[PDB]
Amino acid sequence: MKLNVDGLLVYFPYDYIYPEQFSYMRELKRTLDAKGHGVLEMPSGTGKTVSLLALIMAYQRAYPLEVTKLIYCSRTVPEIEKVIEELRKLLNFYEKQEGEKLPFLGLALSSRKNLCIHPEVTPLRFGKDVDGKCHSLTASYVRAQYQHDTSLPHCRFYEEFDAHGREVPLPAGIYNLDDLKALGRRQGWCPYFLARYSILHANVVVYSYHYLLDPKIADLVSKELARKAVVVFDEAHNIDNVCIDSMSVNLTRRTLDRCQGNLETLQKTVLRAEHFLGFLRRLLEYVKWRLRVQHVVQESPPAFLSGLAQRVCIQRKPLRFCAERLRSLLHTLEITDLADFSPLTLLANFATLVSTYAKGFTIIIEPFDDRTPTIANPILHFSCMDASLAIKPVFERFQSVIITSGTLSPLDIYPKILDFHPVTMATFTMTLARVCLCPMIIGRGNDQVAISSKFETREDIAVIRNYGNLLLEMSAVVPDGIVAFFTSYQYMESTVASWYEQGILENIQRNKLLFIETQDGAETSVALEKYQEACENGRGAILLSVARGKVSEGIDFVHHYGRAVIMFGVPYVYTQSRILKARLEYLRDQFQIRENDFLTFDAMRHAAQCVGRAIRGKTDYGLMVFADKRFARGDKRGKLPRWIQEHLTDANLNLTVDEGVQVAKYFLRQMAQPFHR
């Protein structure tokens, strides 16, 4: 309804507003009035978007000049479609409660493969070739040659959009990605091109994080759209990880083999300017020097360019021209397709990065491979070390950058992990008619022996028996879905092997079905598919996976799915590969970040993120356990989000397996009774 905030009225589709929603609206209004950045933390995946959009629309109506463009970057495409449909529902509610339309446009952005109408490119599963084929079908040279109307198969959506779609705007009517595709196919236009034309004349727009963190595409998609704009990154608990991965590249034997294979074709095309023709010829052999050198690690971010001017004696100046060479030399060469050409492109990007960005970076070479370490594998990876580089451009181009997710417990580490000036420090804890979660930390087992997943005790027989023993009675108290996360696959495979060797794993089998998540995506999908139907009926199942895996955050455990989430030990990232330690050293002498605290912060962030996916919706409920005494310490409990801290009573912090079962039985028994909305 018409919620009356201290200086505005905001229409809300839902008549009932929770106190958490009202407090969040108050905080967001205060932040907008402060004209500054901020950080937010809410535990509701649903219901946050509607309130955010309602307050954004109210602020735009009240202050059209203060706010002009809104960005709602998310992590995946399902988030984009759900926020789009929520915005559509909000617009329908506003229309039915007000009676007149408004000139608001809302569009969703995705990749070329997602937004395309040609049936000759949809079936293929090459994400790096769809853009190249689209460029080959239509480009500047295609437009130039279309005047003569040459008879050749090519895309014609742009050839009609440039004459028809560049005049008629879309002042009203928010269009989803499927709606945009339908409009493009009925008007003979490309959805991507019409989106690129209509972003300027639009009210809101949604897309992924990669369109802003990546400097090679953020400028193209957002250069002078709006100096004063509001951007929000919902579900950005791992924003630092993606920011680091944005400027992270890898090299292997396949890349260099592809480059040496395609340079011959490039030379053959050329022989049919000269400053770069011979420039790239001797670049491949410089990095192949490390191929013949058998060394553990070489670190020299400043001296890497200095050493380049020794073997071949090339100045640093031409390296910066590689970025602009792509749009000049390549388009004149008329490359048929990006196939067998992508590794060549990243080499130019790699050269520009080392030449320009070397203050907070480090070059790492590691000749180690899984189960075949020393055969042949000199791996060069320009791993980033500072997360501020990927976030600096957006902070100076925007005024009210907001970071929010379901797990942002430490609000004092994000402003120092990346250069930030928070003025909010706001946390919210959801409340219902009953406690929907029962977090508890299990310490010593029934034998009064700690079950901590310590590195020196991974092979211990006493601890591994308790882990199976804990899962035994737990499988018989919480039905239809239990999700268990392990530290790593190597620890996971050794865990089940010990259980299989003993006569204990078979007892779990007759209660619930044991499903193991593997690295293969196809095998994971079918395993998840049978898990969903196993929990659908009364047979039940157990989902075993890893905390740092694609399945931990790729799926959401809605109610009746995964009623219990089990964390077998504190998930600590492996210290090998000499990558994390490089980041630890950089943060040590730059941001004064404690090495132990950052590892604890990273360990608890992933642990709290995955365990927080069992509560989606007010009516949803679930069980949360921690199979490690290390969680019981105050330094790690404080790293849990505030909406879980108050429900984690001090009575159950070191209780045994048998005590934990009794708490679970009591909690689930009283949570099945009917309630009121």
Added chain:
Amino acid sequence: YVICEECGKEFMDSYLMNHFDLPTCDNCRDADDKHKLITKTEAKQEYLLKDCDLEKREPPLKFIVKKNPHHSQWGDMKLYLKLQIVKRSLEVWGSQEALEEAKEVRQENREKMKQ
């Protein structure tokens, strides 16, 4: 520009200014004796200073998180400027004689408790 309190030469950026807000250039940085860095626990034991006195009494005292020169077992020790710690201890306890009396009565109480 910041004027050094030792030499008087103006400087823009220096290690002491960056890490402890000390108006002293790197040329006059006597990190050997005058600007020696000590661990937090050592300072607390010697000067009988509490955490709040090192974190909440204005002005707050900065520190450098430096990895221990020994093994990587558990380093990342916090180091504070000796001059700032001495000044804070003198401000809290009034005089050095008061601090000496405090440590003497503390060790006397420790002996009393153990006996």
